[PDB]
Amino acid sequence: MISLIAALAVDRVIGMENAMPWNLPADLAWFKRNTLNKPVIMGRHTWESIGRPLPGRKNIILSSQPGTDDRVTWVKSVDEAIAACGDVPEIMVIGGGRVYEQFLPKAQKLYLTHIDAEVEGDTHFPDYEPDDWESVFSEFHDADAQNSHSYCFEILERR
Ligand SMILES: NC(=O)c1ccc[n+]([C@@H]2O[C@H](COP(=O)([O-])OP(=O)(O)OC[C@H]3O[C@@H](n4cnc5c(N)ncnc54)[C@H](OP(=O)(O)O)[C@@H]3O)[C@@H](O)[C@H]2O)c1
Ligand SMILES: Nc1nc(=O)c2nc(CNc3ccc(C(=O)N[C@@H](CCC(=O)O)C(=O)O)cc3)cnc2[nH]1
Ligand SMILES: [Mn+2]
């Protein structure tokens, strides 16, 4: 099974200038809980944005060019990325925009954080079709001293 995990600001913005400008520790904790001990697939730009391997996960990087770091696994196509995960219950696709576009048609589950924040951005999560997806979990949180915007964790499953 393939799942996508992402945090979206207003208008489905996910990034600006190869960065995420906000800081929401509760959402990063949610990301870690839902990805630990699973393979994670990311594109090369997202690899550069994170800047280091994510511990406790098999890190698989998509790039058309040879890899430059043997601490992670480098693959050249979607099918190779999936194969490199092996026989696991759940593969996590962690972006960015171009990668989300390619994996969305193959995904059964979306883990989305909706952040109440207006961000200028240059990268968006794909337009998906709402009728295709059922909300199976949602949890709203007001802003607090650690998290400066309100946010909503949602899990969608393909109908
Ligand atoms: N808010 C969130 O949840 C979230 C999550 C992830 C990322 N982001 C943000 O998203 C942005 C990065 O997204 P992006 O769309 O620019 O880039 P991306 O999807 O991370 O990376 C695209 C790169 O991946 C490689 N690639 C993708 N598909 C491939 C394929 N089928 N075969 C081979 N290589 C493939 C290519 O690398 P080569 O050019 O080397 O061939 C391509 O240039 C940043 O702003 C980041 O902060 C946000
Ligand atoms: N919900 C969500 N939030 C995100 O921030 C996110 N980020 C990416 C890609 N970028 C990043 C950037 C940093 C870290 C990171 O530092 N993660 C640590 C945090 C642990 C914690 O804060 O508790 C990790 O071990 O996962 C992960 C992904 C993909 N999907 C996401 N999905
Ligand atoms: Mn092929």
Ligand SMILES: [Mn+2]
């Ligand atoms: Mn197999």
Ligand SMILES: [Mn+2]
């Ligand atoms: Mn806000």
